[PDB]
Amino acid sequence: GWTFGAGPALQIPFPMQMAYRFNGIGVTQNVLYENQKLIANQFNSAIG
Protein backbone atom coordinates (compact mmCIF):
# COMPACT_ATOMS: atom_id res chain seq x y z
CA GLY A 1 0.00 0.00 0.00
CA TRP A 2 1.24 3.44 0.99
CA THR A 3 2.65 2.25 4.33
CA PHE A 4 6.13 2.27 2.77
CA GLY A 5 5.68 6.01 2.15
CA ALA A 6 5.84 6.76 5.88
CA GLY A 7 7.99 4.06 7.47
CA PRO A 8 8.70 0.37 6.93
CA ALA A 9 6.92 -1.54 4.18
CA LEU A 10 3.94 -3.22 5.87
CA GLN A 11 2.21 -5.71 3.58
CA ILE A 12 -1.55 -5.77 3.03
CA PRO A 13 -3.71 -7.69 0.51
CA PHE A 14 -4.72 -5.59 -2.47
CA PRO A 15 -8.53 -5.96 -2.05
CA MET A 16 -8.17 -4.51 1.46
CA GLN A 17 -5.90 -1.67 0.32
CA MET A 18 -8.48 -1.06 -2.42
CA ALA A 19 -11.18 -1.06 0.28
CA TYR A 20 -9.45 1.55 2.43
CA ARG A 21 -8.69 3.66 -0.66
CA PHE A 22 -12.42 3.51 -1.38
CA ASN A 23 -13.03 4.49 2.26
CA GLY A 24 -10.79 7.53 1.81
CA ILE A 25 -12.99 9.07 -0.89
CA GLY A 26 -16.28 8.75 1.01
CA VAL A 27 -17.88 5.41 0.13
CA THR A 28 -17.72 2.46 2.50
CA GLN A 29 -15.70 -0.70 1.94
CA ASN A 30 -18.75 -2.95 1.50
CA VAL A 31 -19.56 -1.47 -1.93
CA LEU A 32 -16.13 -2.65 -3.02
CA TYR A 33 -16.54 -5.95 -1.20
CA GLU A 34 -19.48 -6.97 -3.38
CA ASN A 35 -18.27 -5.08 -6.45
CA GLN A 36 -14.70 -6.45 -6.46
CA LYS A 37 -15.07 -8.38 -9.73
CA LEU A 38 -16.64 -5.41 -11.53
CA ILE A 39 -13.94 -3.07 -10.15
CA ALA A 40 -11.17 -5.43 -11.29
CA ASN A 41 -12.70 -5.81 -14.76
CA GLN A 42 -13.09 -2.02 -15.07
CA PHE A 43 -9.46 -1.55 -14.02
CA ASN A 44 -8.26 -4.13 -16.56
CA SER A 45 -10.31 -2.60 -19.39
CA ALA A 46 -9.05 0.90 -18.55
CA ILE A 47 -5.40 -0.19 -18.35
CA GLY A 48 -5.84 -1.98 -21.67
Partner: peptide
Amino acid sequence: VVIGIVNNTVYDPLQPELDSFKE
Protein backbone atom coordinates in the same frame (compact mmCIF):
# COMPACT_ATOMS: atom_id res chain seq x y z
CA VAL B 1 -20.90 -12.54 -1.95
CA VAL B 2 -17.68 -11.47 -0.17
CA ILE B 3 -14.55 -13.26 -1.37
CA GLY B 4 -12.40 -14.64 1.43
CA ILE B 5 -14.93 -14.17 4.23
CA VAL B 6 -14.09 -16.33 7.24
CA ASN B 7 -16.36 -17.85 9.89
CA ASN B 8 -16.36 -16.28 13.35
CA THR B 9 -18.77 -15.06 16.02
CA VAL B 10 -19.50 -11.52 17.12
CA TYR B 11 -20.37 -10.44 20.66
CA ASP B 12 -23.67 -8.68 21.30
CA PRO B 13 -23.37 -6.50 24.44
CA LEU B 14 -27.15 -6.44 24.93
CA GLN B 15 -27.63 -10.23 25.12
CA PRO B 16 -25.92 -10.79 28.53
CA GLU B 17 -27.29 -7.49 29.85
CA LEU B 18 -31.01 -8.09 29.25
CA ASP B 19 -31.22 -11.46 31.03
CA SER B 20 -29.14 -10.64 34.13
CA PHE B 21 -31.74 -8.14 35.38
CA LYS B 22 -35.01 -9.28 33.78
CA GLU B 23 -34.34 -13.00 34.27
